[PDB]
């Protein structure tokens, strides 16, 4: 604790540049820090959590403040379909005059926003820059508060005990009823009091919200139980959003489908959704036994779920202790569920646009889908990484004897071998069918293509009421008890939306959609295979039966026993990242091309070209690259210059990653030795001495540095393309 | 315990020997930073603000003949003499003085106080009495000048009005 | 914007002055 890093004496004693790198890379692995106790670990994490939350509120503050100060929110409200929202001003003294003009948006040099903040803020009732700014100040206070809380809870009297941190039943009650439930109840309050009034051109703010009742009938219906009153007189189908013209009085409805003007969910549906959700969460958070002698014990629930056959051995006996005592098990489950939520957000927000006019902001739609699927992809890789770490660091076989978790390890070869089978099957046949299609199309015979109708997915569209395919099942059947039950509620609005081919609600699907879905299945299964193999072999294999003794991350076990490069569970994380990027690539390529085709009104292009891979390269990548790569050229530059420059930058970063991934350490260490030699023997230069002996990056470090360049290049390349291709085209 | 704020404990790193000590440090910046640096920073920010307050007071019934036809308002003046190329000569000259007075050790890491208490830069040509309560008189004038200067420039930005015109009979 | 001078002060600060100060501070911190 007398040289960086203070938390590792083993690193601090390292006389080489490795000390600095490993200091940075291990700074947050609190468990492995010198003299770390379980109590200090939890308390450090809790305080770090306050830091991270404060960061989220400062970032959000920044976005509100920049739009308030430098944006065109007020001008965008006036004309949301034509006006481009501004992110923030550019001040760059490297700009030539031509670049200042190219990026001039009105009277300001500025970036256009593709984050959808204007659409969201406008939908939730924000109407002017002073309201945004008030938001910014409000969130600076929230940041400051969390920084105070963070600071308080690492002061001796305010450090919570380990028993506090392992109070599962209490945290679940509060998080369900309070964090989810009451937040959703309070948010309902915002929609009913502020957002819905704002949608009907009625200003409700801090100035008047005490006096201005969000419904004419007040709270008399709510206490008399005459709740139908709140659903009467919804906004007409002629309602001009932000105005009273065709406005209703309803605050809670079940209209289904879209506001025809804003092509977004009804605010009164979203109000009533959140009321329903709030109640479900408040009830759900009264499940678990705290201090009042009612509710469930989570251990008692788990221990009871042992099938009497003995087919799951001891069932869930021991799982309670295993989960409660492992932060990595907890982080794994949390990342797994959050990943799924992030993917569901991506899928549901494009299909059922919540925000006024954002269906028309094509760049924002594409940006948001892509952003969230890459976050979801990172989260699920992380979930499995912490699954693997859990197995090495926290899993005790003796405490999990013959339970569901121990039984996974018992048949790991059955699991891995079957994931291998499904991956091989999907890979052979998906690549096979695409290559069949490419060859017969290349030979001028597209009628010889294997074009398998996605009839199961088409049948599901028909169950939700899509008439197009000729199936008359459930909601697409007039006589179904499913149809008749919903006819007076959401079904008219929903059927209108689902049978409209202009929106993204249950897009029409054909053979193109069949093939890419099997590509997506291949990617999910293979990424899963790598991560699961990583987790189930983390503790040991036939090649390294004592792997758990070497920990999550180590270079290898040397060239003996045939050679052991990339044997650590960390190496499975490293390999899975490539497959995650590849898979999210296929997903987001598919989303983007399907939407470009829809938005152009040339669905036929996607339908015909998507069934062979040259179609993707030519009609998606090559065709849509033109606006991007002409951001600058010999004749001049335009506002896409920054995406053109970023695009090349990202290709460079991607390719630089290959150096670290392909060329390994020994080459570099030998080269550095000659440079050290040269420096010491060069006059004048040799008066200057390094304090840290320069060495080549470590074996694992280069995998990480290579993967970061690869990942950054991968993401920035696609970001520049998906933005510039969409912005350039519309 | 703190003389200035008895309800708060005394700032430990502060001492009564230091010039202008009231034990006033509610934020405890004397815990965050070396007192010798803060002390040096205080007197300097003072000495600079002192000259800044005089600058505004003199250039108002005068403005040196050879620079005549320049606005005496803070921001317009700054913009004029930067365009002129006078402020860049002053910047390098102040940069020169900073290196000369501190004798190379200019960094918070480097700056040292071997045989000099904070503020003692070895500038006493008239040879007036230093080691006494005269340091507290410099500090009080410096502290007042720092708030003074802040009051001038904010008055200059608010209603575009002269320092001496403000104290006649005006309200917004 | 209203305070259109601010980017001329803060972008150099965040872009040149503060990164040099931070690099200098971290250099001393990791070499002592």
């Amino acid at each position: 604790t007398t040289k960086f890093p203070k938390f590792s004496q083993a690193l601090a004693s390292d006389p080489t540049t490795r000390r600095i790198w490993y200091g940075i890379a291990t700074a947050h692995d609190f468990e492995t820090h010198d003299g770390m106790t379980e109590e200090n670990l939890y308390q450090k994490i809790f305080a770090s959590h306050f830091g991270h939350l404060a960061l989220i509120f400062l970032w959000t503050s920044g976005n509100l403040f920049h739009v308030a100060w430098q944006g065109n929110f007020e001008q965008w409200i006036a004309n949301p379909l034509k006006t481009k929202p501004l992110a923030h001003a550019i001040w760059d003294p490297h700009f030539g005059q031509a670049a200042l003009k190219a990026f001039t948006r009105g009277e300001t040099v500025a970036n256009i926003s593709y984050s959808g903040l204007y659409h969201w803020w406008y939908t939730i009732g924000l109407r002017n820059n002073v309201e945004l700014y008030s938001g910014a100040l409000g969130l600076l206070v929230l940041s400051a508060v969390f920084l105070l809380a963070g600071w308080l809870h690492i002061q001796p009297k305010f450090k919570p005990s380990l028993s506090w941190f392992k109070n599962n039943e209490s945290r679940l009650n509060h998080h369900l009823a309070g964090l989810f439930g009451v937040s959703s109840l309070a948010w309902t309050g915002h929609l009913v009091h502020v957002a819905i009034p704002a949608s009907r051109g009625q200003h409700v703010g801090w100035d008047n919200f005490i006096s201005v009742a969000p419904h004419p009938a007040g709270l008399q219906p709510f206490f008399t139980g005459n709740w139908s009153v709140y659903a009467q007189s919804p906004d007409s189908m002629q309602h001009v959003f932000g105005t009273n013209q065709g406005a209703g009085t309803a605050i809670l409805t079940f209209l289904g489908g879209f506001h025809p003007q804003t092509q977004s969910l009804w605010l009164t549906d979203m109000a009533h959704h959140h009321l329903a959700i709030a109640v479900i969460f408040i009830v759900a958070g009264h499940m678990y036994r705290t201090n009042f002698g009612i509710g469930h014990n989570l251990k008692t629930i788990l221990e009871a779920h042992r099938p009497p056959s003995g087919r799951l051995g001891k069932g869930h006996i021991g799982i309670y202790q295993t989960l409660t005592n492992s932060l990595h098990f907890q982080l794994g489950l949390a990342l797994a569920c959050l990943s799924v939520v992030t993917s569901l957000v991506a899928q549901h927000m494009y299909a059922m646009p919540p925000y006024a006019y954002m269906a028309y902001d094509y760049v924002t739609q594409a940006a948001l889908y892509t952003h969230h699927q890459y976050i979801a992809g990172l989260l699920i890789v992380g979930a499995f990484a912490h699954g693997a770490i859990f197995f090495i660091r926290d899993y005790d076989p003796e405490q999990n004897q013959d339970n569901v978790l121990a039984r996974m390890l018992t048949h790991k070869e059955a699991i891995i071998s079957h994931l291998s089978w499904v991956s091989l099957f999907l890979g052979f046949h998906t690549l096979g069918l695409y290559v069949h299609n490419d060859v017969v199309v290349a030979f001028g015979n597209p009628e010889k293509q294997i074009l398998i109708e996605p009839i199961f997915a088409q049948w599901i569209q028909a169950t939700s009421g899509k008439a197009l395919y000729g199936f008359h099942v459930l909601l697409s059947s007039s006589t179904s008890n499913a149809t008749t039950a919903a006819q007076q509620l959401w079904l008219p609005g929903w059927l209108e939306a689902i049978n409209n081919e202009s929106n993204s609600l249950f897009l029409t699907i054909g053979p193109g959609d069949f093939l890419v879905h099997h590509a997506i299945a291949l990617g999910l299964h293979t990424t899963t295979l790598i991560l699961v193999k990583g987790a189930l072999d983390a503790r040991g294999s036939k090649l390294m039966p004592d792997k758990k003794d070497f920990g999550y991350s180590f270079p290898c076990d040397g060239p003996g026993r045939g050679g052991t490069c990339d044997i650590s569970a960390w190496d499975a994380f490293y390999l899975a990242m490539f497959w995650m990027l590849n898979t999210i690539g296929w997903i987001t390529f598919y989303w983007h091309w399907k939407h470009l085709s829809l938005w152009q009104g040339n669905v036929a292009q996607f339908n015909e070209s998507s069934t062979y891979l040259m179609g993707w390269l030519r009609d998606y990548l090559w065709l849509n690259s033109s606006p991007l790569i002409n951001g600058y050229n010999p004749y001049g530059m335009n506002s896409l210059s920054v995406w053109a420059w970023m695009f090349l930058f990202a290709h460079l970063v991607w390719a630089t990653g290959f150096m670290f991934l392909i060329s390994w350490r020994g080459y570099w260490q030998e080269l550095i030795e000659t440079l050290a030699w040269a420096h010491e023997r060069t006059p004048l230069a040799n008066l200057i001495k390094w304090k840290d002996k320069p060495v080549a990056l470590s074996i694992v470090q280069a995998r990480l540095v290579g993967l970061v360049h690869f990942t950054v290049g991968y993401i920035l390349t696609y970001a520049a393309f998906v933005i510039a291709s969409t912005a350039g085209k519309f | 315990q703190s003389p200035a704020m008895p309800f708060l404990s005394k700032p430990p790193n502060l001492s009564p020997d230091m010039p202008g000590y009231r034990g006033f440090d509610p934020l405890r910046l004397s815990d965050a930073f070396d007192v010798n640096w803060l002390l040096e920073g205080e007197v300097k920010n003072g000495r600079v603000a002192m000259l800044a307050c005089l600058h505004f007071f003199v250039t108002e019934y005068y403005q040196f003949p050879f620079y005549a036809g320049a606005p005496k308002l803070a921001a317009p003046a700054h913009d004029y003499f930067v365009k002129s190329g006078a402020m860049i000569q002053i910047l390098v000259f102040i940069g020169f003085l900073e290196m000369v007075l501190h004798r190379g050790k200019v960094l918070y890491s480097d700056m040292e106080w071997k045989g000099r208490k904070p503020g003692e830069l070895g500038f006493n040509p008239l040879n007036l009495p230093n080691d006494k309560a005269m340091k507290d008189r410099e500090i009080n004038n410096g502290r007042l000048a720092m708030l003074g200067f802040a009051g001038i420039i904010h008055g200059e930005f608010l209603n575009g009005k002269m320092p001496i015109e403000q104290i006649t009979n005006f309200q917004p | 914007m209203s305070a259109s001078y601010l980017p001329s002060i803060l972008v150099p600060t965040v872009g040149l002055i503060l990164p040099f100060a931070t690099m200098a501070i971290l250099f001393v911190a990791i070499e002592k």
């Binding site: 100060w69 700014y133 600071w151 | - | -």
Partner: peptide, 28 residues
Amino acid sequence: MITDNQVFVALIMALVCGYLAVKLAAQL
């Protein structure tokens, strides 16, 4: 439109967050 005063009020509150952030950072 956001006034000079509003931008400077934001900056002092951001300064306060800076102070409280350094306080937390120094302790963690």
